Amino acid sequence: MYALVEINGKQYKAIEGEFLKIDKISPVEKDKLEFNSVLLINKDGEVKIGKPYVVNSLIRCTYKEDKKDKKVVSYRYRRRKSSERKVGHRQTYSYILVDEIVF
Amino acid sequence: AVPKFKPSKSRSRTRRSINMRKKIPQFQECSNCGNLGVRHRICLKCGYYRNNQYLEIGL
Amino acid sequence: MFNLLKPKGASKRRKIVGRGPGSGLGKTSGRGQKGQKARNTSPRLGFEG
Amino acid sequence: NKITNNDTIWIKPKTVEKKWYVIDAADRILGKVAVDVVKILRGKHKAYYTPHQDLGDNVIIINASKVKLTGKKYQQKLYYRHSRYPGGLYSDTFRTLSERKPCAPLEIAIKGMLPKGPLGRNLFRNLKVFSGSEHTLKAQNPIKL
Amino acid sequence: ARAKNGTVHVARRKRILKKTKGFWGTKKSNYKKAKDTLRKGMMYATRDRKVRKRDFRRLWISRISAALSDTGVTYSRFIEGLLKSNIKINRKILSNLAIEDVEAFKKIVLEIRR
Amino acid sequence: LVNRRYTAKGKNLPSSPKKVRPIADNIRGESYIKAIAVLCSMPNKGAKLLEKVVKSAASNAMYHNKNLSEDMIFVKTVMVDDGRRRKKIWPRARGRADRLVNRNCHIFVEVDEKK
Amino acid sequence: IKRKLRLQLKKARFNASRSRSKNKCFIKRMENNRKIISKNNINVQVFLVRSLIGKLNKKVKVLKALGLNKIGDKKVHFLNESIKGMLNETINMILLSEVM
RNA sequence: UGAAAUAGAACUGAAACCGUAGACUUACAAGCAGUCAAAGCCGUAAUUUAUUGCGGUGAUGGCGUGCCUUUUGCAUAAUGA
RNA sequence: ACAUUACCGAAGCUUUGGAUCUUAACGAAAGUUAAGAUGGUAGGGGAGCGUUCUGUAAGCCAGAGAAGUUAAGCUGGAAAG
Ligand SMILES: [Zn+2]
């Protein structure tokens, strides 16, 4: 059993007991998350597809932590112009543990 | 008539390893002393060759 | 340790020039491309060419 | 802890098991036949298609000598080749090339339509063309198409 | 007031060499070649970070088109019906679905054809 | 790695490493008898230099391990590095001079009791 | 092949390779815009749909006077003679919808 | 002997350069040698254990005309190492 | 060529996460929000890293291991630490 769920406009494939890495969510909502926009549910054989959301179907999750990714570097330079620029970056991600898929 | 660009270490290594390669001489143990001598040459250690003395080996 | 605590703006740094591309005062060092002025000079005598 | 990877899935080529497909070329049009063959060979009919690796099936073409053309191509299509020696340009019309090598036109067309590089050459290795209506790969139980 | 201590250039070079480890030939040890190859590599890294989005979307589209080859729905029409029936599922999701669980994707297609 | 009890080292020998390495390749891993025969046979300066170093290494091993004879020994490893260089002048036409480098080599041989 | 001729030919082929479907879409948009402009004293929403790069200087000035700087720019304006004239100048780069 | 002799005519001993050993890859292929994807092999940590990561190698796919200076304009077969 | 419905397709547009600056509002202020605005050579303005010496420093940290290369790991938006 799994769910195809939209969080903040990004699809994910949620499975129970099992973490999701999503875009950083505000400190305000670091307590207990409920997501109401489920696109698809596959339960033990049979599948329900929402138009655009499957009604009466929730996903309940517990916020766990925030974690930074590996560092990336944006670099550019202009040939035979003696000019460049370098910028570092590290994106932040939030990890949520899916408890149950209200099906 | 002059190198246009410095060759890569791969090319230099390849050429050097192929060219600077010496081959082992064949051997055959002397019937007299048991030394390993060059095949078809007088033994340098005892002087015999096919059971015939030819040298008188000194110091 | 008593931290003299200089007033702000009391000493500009300098206009160190010709020390890299990132400083904005790089190879050409504020002089432009070529000509008389690129090489130390300008005809002084209130000159109008 | 375990993370649900919401990333594109890649299927290990050691768990994909290649079949053979028979395609008949009788009374078909050369380009259409070649296009079908390329689509099968490339792997573009499987959900896990990947241009990196070789995941498509193999193809046996039968009756390759009965491909039909339209227009005056039978008299006018030219197959060129160059010996790399000076002036050594040799042409060969469709008639003559077909008579000398019955499988050559279809092999040439499929080679042109396949991608280029090591994988393209491998894909062409994955193809068998027969002039007649019978093939020697009976041991593979090829699926007819 | 002589200000010579040259513990700077070796530092720059050590960082560069650390980042340029696996390169071919003399590009991994010489300072000049390593710096040239690294600098063009980082620019490639930026460009390619933006290109990876295009590449993966193209892959997903091709996979969807392959999974639909069976049925009679050209996937332009598939996207058509998808939007028209108001199913806002994603190209990545559909591509992965057609591999993990083919029958769900097939059911989606039956549902689109309406 | 080295059992430095069993090894010989010859520093600044009068030959170029580029010329001594092939002879080393021909005896690496061979038995002591075979290697000694090869070096005696082959009429190369590097061959004679290796012969001296190899014989010395075997002598050291025997001296420190009295129950090891000439026919349980095999040449385990052989390394040939480059040593000091000397520059001398070779004068050419039109007053042009060229510098004429003379190279030396270090030789390291370790023997070991055969399999 | 002579360079003068091949440049002419390449340019002519590029120009002639336009799609009638795209032309029909553009014609439909123009008709809609003219129909809207023909009205009088209504609030109209103006979207900018074509870029400012490469266009004429006068027309860039008109668009910046309407308030649109980028593609995707949204501005509501009250149709009087001034706005009608500006819209007529820049009709080919805008999309007009009506604010009920 | 000396605290040390990879302190023995020399302290700390890098880079360029020359090597040895082990692991991986390579002899049907047209690679500014890199980046983005990626099977297999090897090292390693977790999850009861062969599927996920830190790693090193990398078949194959996509993209990509070294750099500096000078010019209306250079991968340019303009200049310089 | 003429019609109908589409889709693909850029660093454009939209959305998500993060940073700086201008203006405006709120706030005692710090800052919090709203709006837009940030390709860029010549060239102008502004903000920092790092090296050596001097006062701080007859301070603090070192033979229980200073300085320096050297392997690995980590942080910072860049100089880097
Ligand atoms: Zn003898």
Short mmCIF file of N, CA and C in Angstrom, two decimals, chain A residues 2 4 6 10-13 39-40 42 45-53 72-78 83-84 86, chain E residues 19 36 38-40 42-47 49 85-90 92-93 97 100-101 103-104 107-108 111 114:
data_model
loop_
_atom_site.label_atom_id
_atom_site.label_comp_id
_atom_site.label_asym_id
_atom_site.label_seq_id
_atom_site.Cartn_x
_atom_site.Cartn_y
_atom_site.Cartn_z
N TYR A 2 0.52 2.19 -0.87
CA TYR A 2 1.26 3.43 -0.96
C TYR A 2 0.35 4.53 -1.46
N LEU A 4 0.26 8.48 -3.52
CA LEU A 4 0.87 9.49 -4.39
C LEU A 4 0.29 10.80 -3.90
N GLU A 6 0.67 15.12 -2.83
CA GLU A 6 1.28 16.40 -3.15
C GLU A 6 1.48 17.20 -1.87
N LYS A 10 4.69 19.59 -4.73
CA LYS A 10 5.63 18.60 -5.22
C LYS A 10 5.11 17.21 -4.91
N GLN A 11 5.08 16.35 -5.91
CA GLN A 11 4.61 15.00 -5.72
C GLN A 11 5.62 14.17 -4.95
N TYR A 12 5.12 13.19 -4.21
CA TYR A 12 5.95 12.23 -3.51
C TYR A 12 5.20 10.92 -3.42
N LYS A 13 5.94 9.85 -3.22
CA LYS A 13 5.36 8.52 -3.09
C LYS A 13 5.51 8.09 -1.64
N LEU A 39 -3.10 12.25 -4.30
CA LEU A 39 -3.39 12.10 -5.72
C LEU A 39 -3.82 10.68 -6.06
N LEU A 40 -3.22 9.69 -5.42
CA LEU A 40 -3.52 8.31 -5.75
C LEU A 40 -3.31 7.45 -4.53
N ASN A 42 -2.89 3.24 -3.73
CA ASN A 42 -2.87 1.83 -4.07
C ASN A 42 -2.94 1.07 -2.76
N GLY A 45 -3.75 -4.04 -3.86
CA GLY A 45 -4.32 -4.51 -5.10
C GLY A 45 -5.15 -3.50 -5.86
N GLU A 46 -5.97 -2.69 -5.20
CA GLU A 46 -6.87 -1.83 -5.95
C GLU A 46 -6.53 -0.37 -5.72
N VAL A 47 -6.69 0.42 -6.78
CA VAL A 47 -6.13 1.76 -6.86
C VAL A 47 -7.25 2.76 -7.10
N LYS A 48 -7.20 3.87 -6.37
CA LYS A 48 -8.14 4.97 -6.51
C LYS A 48 -7.37 6.22 -6.91
N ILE A 49 -7.86 6.90 -7.94
CA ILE A 49 -7.17 8.04 -8.53
C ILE A 49 -8.05 9.28 -8.35
N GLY A 50 -7.47 10.34 -7.79
CA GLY A 50 -8.23 11.52 -7.50
C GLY A 50 -8.39 12.44 -8.70
N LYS A 51 -9.46 13.23 -8.66
CA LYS A 51 -9.75 14.23 -9.68
C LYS A 51 -10.06 15.55 -9.00
N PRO A 52 -9.03 16.28 -8.53
CA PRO A 52 -7.62 15.89 -8.60
C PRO A 52 -7.13 15.17 -7.34
N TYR A 53 -7.96 15.11 -6.31
CA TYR A 53 -7.60 14.52 -5.03
C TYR A 53 -8.60 13.43 -4.67
N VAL A 72 27.24 22.73 -3.14
CA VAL A 72 27.43 22.97 -4.56
C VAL A 72 28.02 24.34 -4.77
N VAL A 73 28.71 24.50 -5.88
CA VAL A 73 29.41 25.74 -6.20
C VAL A 73 28.94 26.20 -7.56
N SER A 74 28.50 27.45 -7.65
CA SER A 74 28.15 28.07 -8.91
C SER A 74 29.32 28.93 -9.34
N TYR A 75 29.88 28.63 -10.50
CA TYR A 75 31.07 29.31 -10.96
C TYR A 75 30.83 29.80 -12.37
N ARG A 76 31.34 30.97 -12.68
CA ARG A 76 31.29 31.45 -14.04
C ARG A 76 32.46 32.35 -14.29
N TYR A 77 32.94 32.36 -15.53
CA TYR A 77 34.05 33.23 -15.87
C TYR A 77 33.97 33.55 -17.35
N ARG A 78 34.41 34.74 -17.70
CA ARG A 78 34.35 35.22 -19.08
C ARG A 78 35.71 35.09 -19.72
N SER A 83 37.33 38.13 -15.60
CA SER A 83 36.24 38.37 -14.68
C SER A 83 35.53 37.06 -14.42
N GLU A 84 35.06 36.88 -13.20
CA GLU A 84 34.42 35.64 -12.79
C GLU A 84 33.59 35.90 -11.56
N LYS A 86 32.06 33.31 -8.06
CA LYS A 86 31.92 32.03 -7.40
C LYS A 86 30.96 32.20 -6.24
N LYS E 19 40.95 18.98 -5.12
CA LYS E 19 39.70 18.85 -5.89
C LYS E 19 39.89 18.20 -7.24
N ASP E 36 43.46 25.06 -14.95
CA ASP E 36 42.68 25.27 -16.16
C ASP E 36 41.56 24.26 -16.28
N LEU E 38 40.17 22.42 -13.84
CA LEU E 38 39.20 22.60 -12.78
C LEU E 38 38.26 23.76 -13.09
N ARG E 39 38.80 24.88 -13.55
CA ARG E 39 37.95 26.06 -13.74
C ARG E 39 36.93 25.80 -14.84
N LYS E 40 37.33 25.14 -15.92
CA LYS E 40 36.34 24.80 -16.94
C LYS E 40 35.39 23.73 -16.44
N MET E 42 34.19 23.43 -13.30
CA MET E 42 33.17 24.04 -12.45
C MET E 42 32.10 24.75 -13.24
N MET E 43 32.51 25.44 -14.30
CA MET E 43 31.54 26.04 -15.21
C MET E 43 30.66 25.02 -15.86
N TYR E 44 31.25 23.90 -16.29
CA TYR E 44 30.46 22.77 -16.75
C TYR E 44 29.51 22.30 -15.67
N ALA E 45 29.96 22.27 -14.42
CA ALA E 45 29.10 21.80 -13.35
C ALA E 45 27.87 22.68 -13.22
N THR E 46 28.04 23.99 -13.31
CA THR E 46 26.89 24.89 -13.23
C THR E 46 25.94 24.67 -14.39
N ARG E 47 26.48 24.71 -15.61
CA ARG E 47 25.65 24.50 -16.78
C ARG E 47 24.89 23.19 -16.68
N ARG E 49 24.16 21.38 -14.04
CA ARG E 49 23.13 21.40 -13.01
C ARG E 49 21.84 21.98 -13.55
N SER E 85 -9.43 15.51 -17.82
CA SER E 85 -10.06 14.85 -16.70
C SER E 85 -9.47 15.29 -15.38
N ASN E 86 -8.52 16.24 -15.41
CA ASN E 86 -8.13 16.96 -14.21
C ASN E 86 -7.37 16.08 -13.23
N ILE E 87 -6.45 15.30 -13.74
CA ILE E 87 -5.55 14.47 -12.97
C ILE E 87 -4.19 15.12 -12.97
N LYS E 88 -3.82 15.76 -11.88
CA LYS E 88 -2.57 16.52 -11.85
C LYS E 88 -1.44 15.69 -11.26
N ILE E 89 -1.18 14.55 -11.87
CA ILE E 89 -0.03 13.75 -11.49
C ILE E 89 1.12 14.12 -12.41
N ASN E 90 2.32 13.75 -12.01
CA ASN E 90 3.55 14.30 -12.53
C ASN E 90 4.23 13.35 -13.51
N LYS E 92 7.43 12.55 -13.67
CA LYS E 92 8.30 11.63 -12.94
C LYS E 92 7.50 10.53 -12.28
N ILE E 93 6.38 10.89 -11.67
CA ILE E 93 5.57 9.93 -10.97
C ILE E 93 5.00 8.89 -11.93
N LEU E 97 5.75 4.98 -12.08
CA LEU E 97 4.62 4.08 -11.89
C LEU E 97 4.60 3.00 -12.93
N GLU E 100 7.24 0.40 -11.56
CA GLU E 100 6.96 -0.27 -10.30
C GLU E 100 5.70 -1.09 -10.34
N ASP E 101 4.61 -0.48 -10.83
CA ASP E 101 3.29 -1.10 -10.81
C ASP E 101 2.56 -0.76 -12.11
N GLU E 103 0.05 -2.12 -13.65
CA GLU E 103 -1.42 -2.19 -13.78
C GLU E 103 -2.08 -0.92 -13.31
N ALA E 104 -1.52 -0.23 -12.31
CA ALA E 104 -2.09 1.05 -11.92
C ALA E 104 -2.00 2.06 -13.06
N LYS E 107 -4.55 1.26 -15.61
CA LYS E 107 -5.87 1.71 -15.19
C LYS E 107 -6.02 3.21 -15.41
N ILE E 108 -4.97 3.97 -15.10
CA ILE E 108 -5.01 5.41 -15.37
C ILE E 108 -5.27 5.66 -16.84
N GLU E 111 -8.81 5.02 -17.77
CA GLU E 111 -9.58 6.13 -17.25
C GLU E 111 -9.41 7.40 -18.09
N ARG E 114 -11.58 7.93 -21.67
CA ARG E 114 -12.89 8.55 -21.62
C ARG E 114 -12.89 9.97 -22.18
#
